């Protein structure tokens, strides 16, 4: 039943904060944790993400982690910052210098027992814990390095619980430092081994959606994070509203243990040019949802094949019309679904739409196209590593080169794995 | 002679709910358990007492156990209209479910809850002066419905070796399922359960879904729609045990009348008529009998014309007299394609119960003056094993999703052993049925 | 045709229409399987915890 | 748009129907094992009928009637005609035939043979790997499942040349079980000597070709010959009888094979084989469930299949068929 939420580092806490703003709103929980909604449906499954405090106050089951205090302070000051349990902010002062070795081995080690203490206290009060969800980036140092350290320690203490992540991948187009390929390649290694489902959110795709479709000339991290929180709200609707526990979702979405990296999508994506108020029809939602221009990993689905596809519709709309359009698109893209997993496209509907939208759709795909994202990281990693460029920041934290080689070798193996299943047929 | 019902997993529990609700309507049992026509208080051994015992305050209590590895579906029972009917011991819930993983339902969680279930079943058995056996309701595709049910049936053969066990099993349909692993769970549970079931009635959700769209004109049926229709079929199949009658009045007669070969123990059910309550033209005995040979009215879509009948049984409810049945049988046999195996007699066992079908007030099914459920053991139902077996073969050739089962302590070899058992099942049907 | 075995109860009747004549594992073994499964799960867990300790 | 798959890489005819579908820009071919198809151009043998009609949201059509072998197996055709109430007494257009295994009619065969030789009547039979012979023992030593059929000793001989022949007619049965007889038939032709060459008219048992191109003669000419040679027409002297035989055979099995009210739908193209004796009487020889076509006719007939059987169910955005009624 219950999920424990962790958010780590700058990117993780900023996206994490918006996610809680959004879904708190959807559940009628105001910024002080008081409920003021109008439907039993909002409270039916409220404990999945919220603990109940005396006086019908709802407190997010959220742990906030970081190695410098800046972003934590900004959250407490943000809209719903009062909503978070004060004891659940865990943070240091050194920072991680955008450096995976510092997040994972030197600065992070110091702080990790304190995070595990808060996790234990939240777990112990769970009637029956489903699992954990972590939001973080892979290009920085705290989200990437400490985040994957956290997942390793959680798995050791809770080996039989589900571990899912929303993981922002780096891209040169929206880049903070040149070492990002190193931090992400070291993290994918961990994720391959220790998560059950990872939602890959590529900052390049986020940017391009804001630029090309939303017609936003100069997007901000605020913009990107709004897209991500709407997508996070969509994928978790089946957990927060009547309809699906984490394990049953992973069993039906993950056909091989290592290929559990998903491509999310959202619709509608429209320009606010006196179109925003136009009622959107079920055809429009469904065509967008499967369009490349709508997917948040910079991967061409037409370049690979889908293993599984979950599509979630929100709002009041014809359930009949929904099936008609989901079937229509499978006939269109018949080529893009493997034929050896019968009935691998599945649909859910939920009547509670997001704030401000009569209907919406979220797409969750396990596509071999994702291999393109990993091979891009691999290419960037290799360009630097072959010259040992910027390696001294990591070897100076006690890491050896051999750990970089293993991580690179592990990701390339992953890429070849996607390639095998893309070419596999029922013949 | 008592019957104990066992409802396993979400599909079994919710179908069990629709059935017991219907029973109460049919027998005149109020939601609070009281039965005004039952003039023997706290006792008696009438026909309906095969499904209900009686408290001293006059309550009529189903002879039922509800088990689910997750509590939210059984909480419905605890809070429904007929909550006042059951007591806590009859409701057994775990904390977390099998996640559509047969291995998790059978090995990991099954091992831990089976003795409690058997203990609760034992507590009903000890209330029975002459226990007949068990009716077991479950889905093929659920981790619990598939995985725990096969564990339970093994153990029931151990504990009640001389008792009959019948199955009502929901066969998986993509129209109303979100899972992709149900072909695995389906084969795994059929292989392990086969030696332990005397007679299994499969309902294909696809068929129920399509009968609800077409006959009741429901754009998108819900489980509630599907379960009300299923409970009509269950009720007419079990009415012989619950009402004064002569045909199929004890569980062993089901095997005797429908199952010459132990492994071929899956009769095809066909029901008629299904009529939208919003409508109507009232069909004849010949017409509804003719409807029983329409693939569109079957609980599993398949084509009986291209198989062989081994046995065939007609259950009528309502305004039906024998002369009507015989004239209707005579006519249809000159028109339709019907070929029995040469080593069986070409004939029908007919039962008429004069009480017309009962419906849930305010439900989608119209009250009709007569209806019929045909139970026929056709080799044509082998089509459904072939469909299921082929989906299994497609995923299994790439070992897709196998790691989830192995990770729960199952051996990869069990997939093969189960699959090869199904291959033999298909071979058995072909031998019986083809020239 | 031939109609046989006509039983007339008060709740209806029953009869047969003929149209043409013709021409286990013990409890211990179950236990072994379940405990076997348990041990394979426990072995797999121990490898995991050993691997994490490394 | 519509989707179909191809699973008989040897279908002369449906290779052309497949190419036409593609030319319409509104059909696309998925790999042979993709389950989400509207049309299956299926395999001659073991076609997985029981997996058709269970794909959500998909109307599925196939080009074979499950159960139609009852008419297209030479052994099965005989048992059907003999034991079908609809044809048993009524069948005066099928040669006396017997089933014989190496439910068997060995004893009955000998009974009519004795009548024949004893009465000194024509007593030449053809078992079918064929063998035409007049002594009953010479035939059976060859069979040790075949059928033994009375060989038509007085066939209508084309002149000049004194040549045997047979008539192929193409029949399309759509999903609604309308019976469409293709306007065009072919004769396949041999001099007859009362040496298996002038006795077997198969296009392979001949391949020669001086009288007509490819030993095949079409209806335009065969009609003119009947007019010139015998003062009758193809329609009056033969085609009425052909239409009656097609209707009898196909209406007989309709309850066993019709796909109306079934969860998937069938159509099928048939080739009936006929003989004409010298009293202008027509005789059904066999029924082929997987026929090729006359090279000249592939174009027109394959377009008729698409028009009448395929597009009739999956519509796109005069008549070559005679409709045989009910
Ligand atoms: C810039 C376009 C704004 C609105 C559109 C007309 C449309 O909604 C609509 O037609 C109508 C209503 C949307 C209501 C919600 C969702 C609200 O969060 C929108 C937010 O205030 C607007 C913009 C934020 C601050 C980000 O810059 C943006 C990137 C978030 C992202 C979810 C928008 C996708 C659109 O397709 C959206 C759903
Ligand atoms: N007809 C019908 N089918 C149902 C119902 N509930 C679930 N199903 C079907 O049953 C299958 C899912 O299995 P469930 O019964 O939900 O699973 P379970 O036995 O509860 O086991 P777990 O949830 O995995 O622990 C799918 O094929 C569903 O379509 C129901 O109430 N009626
Ligand atoms: N009863 C009969 N009397 C006279 N000729 C006959 C006959 N039965 C068969 N034949 C001749 O033998 C030839 C082959 O017959 P049949 O059709 O039974 O064999 P087959 O199926 O191998 C060839 P196809 O499939 O092309 O028609 C026919 O073309 C016909 O001329
Ligand atoms: N979408 C998004 N990406 C971010 C945000 N903040 C940082 N990033 C990206 O995350 C990576 C840097 O990681 P960061 O979270 O800042 O480092 P950390 O604090 O040590 O975990 C780079 O890929 C940045 O583009 C944010 O708020 N939104
Ligand atoms: Ca009583
Ligand atoms: Ca032939
Ligand atoms: Mg930063
Ligand atoms: Mg369940």
Judged by CB atoms closer than 8 Å, whether chains meet at B387 and D50 is answered as: yes
> Which of the ligands is closest to the CA of residue A99?
4
Give the residue from A197, A221, A255 where a domain finishes: A255
A225 is in an annotated binding site: yes
Distance between CA atoms of residues D56 and D48, nearest Å: 18
Distance between CA atoms of residues D143 and A315, nearest Å: 73
C18: nearest CB among B195, B325, B345? B345
User: Strand locations in chain D, DSSP E?
Assistant: 2-6, 27-29, 39-41, 61-62, 97-100, 125-127, 131-133, 146-150, 165-173, 179-189, 216-218, 265-266, 268-276, 282-288, 321-324
Q: Is D157 helix (H, G, I), strand (E, B) or coil?
A: coil
Q: What is the CATH number of the domain that holds A364?
A: 3.30.1330.20
Closest CA to B374 of B284, B282, B295: B295
Q: What is the CATH number of the domain that holds D323?
A: 3.30.470.20
Q: What is the CATH number of the domain that holds D129?
A: 3.30.1490.20
CB-CB contact of B106 with B61 (8 Å): no
Distance between CA atoms of residues A191 and A200, nearest Å: 11
Q: Are residues A295 and A375 in the same domain?
A: no
B-chain residues within 8 Å CB-CB of D53? 301
Q: Are residues D100 and D166 in the same domain?
A: no
C-alpha pair distances (Å), D220 with each of D170, D186, D187, D215: 16, 10, 11, 15
Is B21 annotated as catalytic? no
User: Strand locations in A44-171, DSSP E?
Assistant: 50-53, 57-60, 62-66, 89-91, 129-137, 162-169
Closest CA to A325 of A365, A280, A368, A366: A280
Q: Are residues B245 and B279 in the same domain?
A: no
Q: Are residues A244 and A313 in the same domain?
A: no
What 8-state DSSP symbol labels residue B367?
P
Distance between CA atoms of residues A419 and A417, nearest Å: 5
Task: Name the strand (E) or helix (H) holding A141.
Answer: none
Nearby residues of A420 by Cβ (< 8 Å), 6 or more positions away: none
Q: What is the 3-state secondary structure (H, E, C) of C4-52?
A: EEEEEECCEEEEEEEEECCCCCCHHHHHHHHHHHHHHHHHHHHHHHHHH
Q: Is A365 helix (H, G, I), strand (E, B) or coil?
A: strand
C-chain residues within 8 Å CB-CB of B195? 24
Closest CA to B198 of B230, B233, B231, B157: B157
Query: Which residues does residue C9 pair with via DSSP β-bridges, in sequence order?
Result: C12
Query: How many Cβ atoms from other residues are within 10 Å of residue D116's Cβ?
Result: 17
Q: Are residues D203 and D262 in the same domain?
A: yes
B139 is in an annotated binding site: yes
State the distance between the two ends of chain C, measured CA to CA, in whole angstroms: 81
Atom 6 in ligand 4: residue holding the nearest Cα? A11
Q: Are residues A83 and A209 in the same domain?
A: yes
Closest CA to B142 of B204, B196, B68: B68
State the distance between the two ends of chain D, measured CA to CA, in whole angstroms: 34
Tell me the residue range of the domain where B432 lies. 381-435
Q: Are residues D163 and D286 in the same domain?
A: yes
Query: Which residues does residue A32 pair with via DSSP β-bridges, in sequence order?
Result: none
Which residues, by Cβ under 5 Å, contact ligand 5, an ion? Answer: B 38, 40, 44
Q: Are residues A241 and A261 in the same domain?
A: no
Tell me the residue range of the domain where D110 lies. 96-153
Resolution (A): 2.3
A62-66/A89-91 β-pairing: parallel
Q: What is the CATH number of the domain that holds D21?
A: 3.40.50.11480
Query: Which residues does residue A59 pair with via DSSP β-bridges, in sequence order?
Result: A51
CB-CB contact of A347 with A289 (8 Å): no
Q: Are residues B375 and B387 in the same domain?
A: no
Query: For residue D77, how far is its CA from the centre of ligand 3 (angstroms)?
Result: 14
CA B71 to chain centre: 23
Task: Name the strand (E) or helix (H) holding B363.
Answer: none
Closest CA to A243 of A346, A329, A320, A162: A346
Q: Are residues B326 and B415 in the same domain?
A: no
What 8-state DSSP symbol labels residue B357?
P
Chains that touch C (3 or more CB pairs under 8 A): A, B
Distance between CA atoms of residues D323 and D112, nearest Å: 39
Q: Are residues A330 and A358 in the same domain?
A: yes
What is A205-230 written as a DSSP string?
A: HHHHIIIIIS--SS--HHHHHHHHHH
Q: Are residues B322 and B221 in the same domain?
A: no
CB-CB contact of A145 with A100 (8 Å): yes
D36: nearest CB among A324, A331, A427? A331
Q: Are residues D84 and D207 in the same domain?
A: yes
C-alpha pair distances (Å), A410 with each of A136, A147, A193: 21, 19, 10
C-alpha pair distances (Å), A65 with each of A70, A91, A125, B313: 11, 6, 20, 68
What 8-state DSSP symbol labels residue A279?
P
Q: Are residues A359 and A391 in the same domain?
A: no
Tokens of B39: 């003039």
CB-CB contact of D152 with D283 (8 Å): yes
Closest CA to A179 of A142, A139, A138, A136: A139
CB-CB contact of B304 with B340 (8 Å): no
Give the residue from A255, A277, A312 where a domain finishes: A255
Q: What is the CATH number of the domain that holds B329?
A: 3.30.1330.20
Maximal C-alpha separation, chain D: 68
Nearby residues of C46 by Cβ (< 8 Å), 6 or more positions away: none
- Taken in order A77, A81, A87, A89, is the CA torsion positive or negative? negative
Q: Are residues A13 and A133 in the same domain?
A: yes
Q: How many domains does chain D have?
A: 3
Distance between CA atoms of residues A144 and A183, nearest Å: 6
Q: Are residues D189 and D251 in the same domain?
A: yes
CB-CB contact of B94 with B71 (8 Å): yes
Q: What is the CATH number of the domain that holds A407?
A: 1.10.287.600
Nearby residues of D212 by Cβ (< 8 Å), 6 or more positions away: D189, D221
The single residue of B54, B206, B253, B408 carrying the catalytic annotation is B253
Q: Are residues A173 and A286 in the same domain?
A: no
Q: Are residues B341 and B424 in the same domain?
A: no
Closest CA to B271 of B324, B234, B304, B312: B234
Q: How many domains does chain A have?
A: 3
User: Strand locations in B98-181, DSSP E?
Assistant: 131-139, 164-171
Q: Are residues B226 and B319 in the same domain?
A: no
Q: Are residues D316 and D182 in the same domain?
A: yes
Chains that touch A (3 or more CB pairs under 8 A): B, C, D
Query: How many Cβ atoms from other residues are within 10 Å of residue A7's Cβ?
Result: 27
Q: What is the CATH number of the domain that holds A148?
A: 3.40.50.1440
Buried b (16+ CB within 10 A) or exposed e, D135-174: ebeebbebbeebbbbbbbeebbbbeeeebbbbbbbbbbbb
Q: What is the CATH number of the domain that holds B397?
A: 1.10.287.600
Q: Are residues B317 and B255 in the same domain?
A: no
* Nearest ligand 2 atom to alpha carbon B230: 1
Alpha helix segments (H runs only) across A274-391: 282-290, 319-332, 371-385
State the distance between the two ends of chain B, measured CA to CA, in whole angstroms: 42
What is D56-103 written as a DSSP string?
A: TT---EESS-TTTHHHHSHHHHHHHHHH-TTTTTT--SS--EEEE---
Query: How many Cβ atoms from other residues are within 10 Å of residue B318's Cβ?
Result: 19
Closest CA to A250 of A326, A161, A314: A161
Q: Are residues B298 and B195 in the same domain?
A: no
Rg (CA), chain A: 21
Distance between CA atoms of residues B243 and C11, nearest Å: 7
Nearby residues of B374 by Cβ (< 8 Å), 6 or more positions away: B269, B270, B271, B289, B292, B312, B313, B314, B315
* Nearest ligand 3 atom to alpha carbon D204: 26
Q: Are residues A334 and A392 in the same domain?
A: no
D66: left (phi over 0), alpha (psi -120 to 50) or beta: beta
Q: Are residues B11 and B97 in the same domain?
A: yes
Give the residue from A231, A255, A279 where a domain finishes: A255
Touching, D vs C (3+ Cβ pairs under 8 A): no
Distance between CA atoms of residues D170 and D87, nearest Å: 22
Beta-carbon contacts below 8 Å between A and D: 27
Tell me the residue range of the domain where A245 lies. 1-255
Q: Are residues A398 and A416 in the same domain?
A: yes
Q: Are residues B161 and B224 in the same domain?
A: yes
Q: Are residues D199 and D324 in the same domain?
A: yes
Q: Is A60 helix (H, G, I), strand (E, B) or coil?
A: strand
Q: Are residues D267 and D175 in the same domain?
A: yes
User: Strand locations in B342-389, DSSP E?
Assistant: 346-353, 370-378
Tokens of A379: 């290419």
Query: For residue A10, how far is its CA from the centre of ligand 7 (angstroms)?
Result: 6
Experimental method: X-ray
Atom 19 in ligand 1: residue holding the nearest Cα? A356
CB-CB contact of D284 with D179 (8 Å): no
Q: How many domains does chain B have?
A: 3
Any residues with Cβ below 6 Å from ligand 2, and which? B 9-11, 14-15, 69-70, 97-100, 139, 141-145, 170, 172, 176-177, 182, 205, 223, 226-227, 230
Choose from A116, A151, A159 for mutation: most chain C CBs within 10 A.
A159
Q: Are residues B178 and B120 in the same domain?
A: yes
Distance between CA atoms of residues B290 and B273, nearest Å: 11
Q: Are residues A33 and A158 in the same domain?
A: yes
CB-CB contact of D215 with D206 (8 Å): yes
Distance between CA atoms of residues B364 and B383, nearest Å: 30
Judged by CB atoms closer than 8 Å, whether chains meet at A342 and B174 is answered as: yes
A197-202/A62-66 β-pairing: unpaired
C-alpha pair distances (Å), D54 with each of A284, B41, B66, B384, D49: 28, 51, 32, 10, 11
A11, A66, A148: which to mutate for ligand 4, most atoms within 8 A of CB? A11
Assess B101–A contact: CB distance below 8 Å, yes or no.
yes
CA A80 to chain centre: 21
D285, D286, D287, D288: which to mutate for ligand 3, most atoms within 8 A of CB? D285
Q: Are residues A296 and A376 in the same domain?
A: no
User: Strand locations in A150-209, DSSP E?
Assistant: 162-169, 197-202
Tokens of D53: 């009609």
- From B326's Cα to the closest Cα of chain D, the distance in A is 22
Q: What is the CATH number of the domain that holds B108?
A: 3.40.50.1440
Alpha helix segments (H runs only) across B141-222: 143, 149-159, 182-193, 205-216
CB-CB contact of A169 with A200 (8 Å): yes
């Amino acid at each position: 039943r219950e999920i424990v939420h962790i958010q780590a580092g700058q990117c993780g806490n900023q996206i994490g904060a918006k996610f809680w703003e959004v879904i708190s709103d959807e559940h009628g929980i105001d910024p002080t944790g008081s409920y003021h909604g109008d439907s039993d449906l909002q409270l039916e499954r409220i404990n999945v993400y919220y603990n109940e405090a005396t006086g019908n106050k709802y407190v997010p089951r959220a742990i906030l982690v970081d190695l410098e205090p800046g972003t934590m302070d900004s959250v407490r000051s943000g809209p719903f910052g009062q909503i978070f349990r004060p004891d659940n902010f865990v943070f240091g002062q050194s920072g991680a210098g955008n450096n995976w070795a510092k997040g994972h081995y030197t600065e992070g080690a110091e702080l990790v027992d304190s995070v595990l203490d808060v996790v234990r206290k939240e777990s112990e009060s769970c009637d029956c814990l489903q699992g954990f969800q972590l939001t973080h980036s892979l290009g920085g140092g705290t989200g990437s390095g400490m985040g994957t350290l956290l997942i390793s320690k959680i798995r050791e203490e809770y080996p039989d619980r589900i571990m899912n992540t929303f993981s922002v991948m780096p891209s040169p187009k929206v880049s903070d430092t040149v070492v990002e390929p190193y931090n992400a390649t070291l993290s994918v290694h961990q994720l391959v081994e220790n998560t059950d489902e990872t939602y890959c959110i590529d900052n390049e795709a986020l940017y391009d959606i804001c630029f090309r479709t939303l017609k936003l000339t100069t997007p901000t991290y605020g913009d990107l994070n709004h897209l991500v929180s709407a997508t996070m709200s969509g994928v978790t609707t089946c957990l927060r509203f009547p309809g699906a526990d984490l394990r049953k979702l992973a069993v039906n979405m993950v056909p091989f243990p290592r290929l559990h990296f998903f491509m999310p999508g959202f619709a509608p994506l429209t320009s606010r040019g006196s179109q925003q108020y136009r009622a959107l029809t079920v055809p429009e939602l469904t065509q967008q949802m499967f369009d490349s221009k709508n997917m948040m990993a910079a991967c061409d689905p037409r370049h690979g094949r889908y293993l599984t596809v979950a599509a979630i519709f929100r709002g009041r709309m014809s359930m009949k019309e929904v099936d008609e359009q989901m079937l229509n698109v499978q006939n269109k893209n018949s080529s893009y679904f493997v034929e050896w997993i019968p009935n691998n496209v599945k649909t859910a509907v939920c009547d509670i739409p997001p704030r401000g939208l009569k209907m919406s759709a979220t797409f969750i795909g396990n596509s071999t196209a994702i291999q393109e994202l990993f091979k891009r990281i691999s290419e960037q990693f290799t360009a630097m590593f072959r010259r040992k460029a910027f390696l001294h920041w990591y070897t100076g934290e006690g890491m050896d080169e051999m750990e970089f080689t293993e991580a690179e070798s592990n990701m390339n193996d992953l890429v070849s794995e996607y390639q095998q299943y893309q070419d596999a047929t029922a013949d | 002679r008592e019957c104990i019902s066992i409802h396993v997993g979400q599909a079994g529990v919710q179908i069990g709910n629709a059935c017991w609700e219907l029973y109460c309507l049919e027998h005149g049992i109020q939601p609070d358990g009281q039965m005004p026509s039952d003039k023997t208080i706290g006792g008696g051994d009438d026909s309906f007492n095969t499904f209900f015992s009686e408290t001293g305050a006059g309550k009529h209590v189903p002879r039922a156990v509800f088990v689910d590895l997750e509590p939210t579906v059984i909480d419905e029972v605890r809070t429904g209209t007929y909550r006042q009917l059951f007591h806590p011991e009859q409701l057994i819930t775990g904390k977390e479910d099998a996640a559509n993983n047969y291995a998790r339902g059978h090995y990991t969680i099954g091992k831990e809850i089976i003795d409690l279930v058997l203990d609760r079943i034992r507590k009903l058995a000890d209330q029975c002066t002459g226990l007949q056996g068990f009716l077991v309701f479950h889905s093929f595709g659920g981790g619990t419905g598939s995985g725990f049910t096969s564990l339970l049936m093994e153990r029931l053969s151990v504990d009640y070796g001389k008792k009959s066990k019948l199955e009502f099993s929901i066969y998986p349909a993509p129209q109303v399922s979100t899972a992709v692993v149900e072909p695995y769970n389906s084969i795994l549970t059929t292989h392990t359960t086969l030696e332990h079931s005397d007679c299994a009635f499969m309902v294909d959700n696809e068929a129920i879904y399509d009968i609800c769209r077409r006959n009741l004109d429901i754009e998108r049926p819900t489980y509630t729609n599907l379960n009300r229709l299923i409970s009509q079929i269950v009720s007419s199949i079990t009415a012989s045990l619950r009402f004064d009658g002569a045909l199929n009045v004890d569980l062993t007669e089901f095997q005797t009348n429908l199952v010459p070969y132990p492994r071929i123990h899956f009769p095809l059910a066909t029901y008629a008529p299904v009529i939208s309550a919003e409508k109507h033209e009232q069909l004849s005995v010949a017409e509804i009998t003719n409807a029983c040979f329409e693939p569109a009215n079957q609980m599993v879509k398949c084509d009986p014309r291209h198989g062989k009948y081994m046995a065939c049984c007609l259950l009528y409810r309502g305004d039906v007299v024998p002369k009507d049945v015989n004239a209707a049988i005579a006519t249809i046999k000159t028109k339709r394609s019907i070929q029995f195996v040469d080593w069986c007699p070409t004939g029908f066992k007919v039962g008429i119960n004069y009480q017309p079908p009962t419906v849930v007030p305010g439900g989608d099914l119209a009250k009709v003056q007569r209806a019929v459920c045909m139970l026929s053991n056709t080799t044509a139902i082998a089509e459904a094993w072939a469909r299921l077996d082929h989906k299994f073969d497609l995923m299994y050739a790439k070992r897709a999703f196998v790691h989830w089962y192995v990770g729960e302590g199952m051996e990869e070899g069990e997939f093969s052993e189960a699959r090869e058992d199904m291959a033999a099942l298909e071979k058995d049907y072909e031998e019986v049925g083809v020239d | 045709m031939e109609v046989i075995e006509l039983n007339k109860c008060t709740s209806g009747q029953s009869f047969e229409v003929i149209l043409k004549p013709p021409s286990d594992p013990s409890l211990e073994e179950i236990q072994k399987k379940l405990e076997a499964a348990e041990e394979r799960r426990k072995y797999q867990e121990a490898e995991l915890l050993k691997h994490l300790a490394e | 748009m519509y989707t179909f798959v191809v699973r008989d890489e040897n279908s002369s005819v449906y290779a052309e129907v497949s190419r036409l579908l593609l030319a319409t820009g509104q059909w696309k071919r998925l790999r042979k094992d993709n389950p989400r198809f509207n049309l299956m151009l299926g395999e001659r043998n073991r076609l997985p009928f029981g997996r058709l009609g269970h794909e959500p949201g998909l109307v599925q059509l196939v080009n074979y009637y499950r159960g139609a072998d009852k008419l297209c197996r030479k052994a099965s055709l005989v048992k059907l005609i003999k034991t079908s109430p609809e044809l048993s007494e009524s069948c005066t257009w099928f040669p006396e035939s017997y089933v014989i295994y190496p439910t068997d009619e060995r004893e009955v065969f000998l009974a009519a043979y004795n009548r024949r030789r004893e009465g000194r009547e024509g007593n030449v039979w053809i078992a079918k790997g064929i063998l035409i012979s007049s002594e009953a023992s010479e035939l059976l030593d060859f069979i040790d499942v075949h059928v033994i059929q009375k060989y038509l000793e007085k066939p209508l001989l084309l002149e000049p040349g004194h040549r045997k022949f047979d008539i192929r007619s193409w029949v399309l049965v759509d999903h609604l079980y309308n019976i469409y007889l293709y306007r065009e038939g072919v004769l396949r032709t041999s001099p007859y000597n009362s040496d298996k060459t002038c006795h077997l008219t198969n296009h392979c048992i001949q391949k020669y070709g001086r009288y007509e191109e490819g030993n095949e003669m079409f209806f335009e000419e065969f009609n003119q010959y009947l007019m010139d040679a015998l003062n009758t027409t193809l329609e009056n002297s033969i085609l009425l009888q052909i239409k009656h035989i097609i209707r009898s055979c196909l209406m007989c099995i309709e309850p066993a094979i019709s796909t109306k009210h079934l969860h998937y739908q069938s159509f099928q193209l048939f080739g009936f084989d006929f003989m004409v004796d010298e009293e202008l009487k027509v005789w059904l020889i066999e029924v082929n469930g997987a026929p090729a076509c006359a090279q000249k006719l592939y174009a027109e007939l394959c377009q008729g299949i698409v028009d009448v059987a395929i597009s009739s169910v999956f519509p796109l955005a005069t008549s070559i068929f005679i409709k045989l009624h009910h």
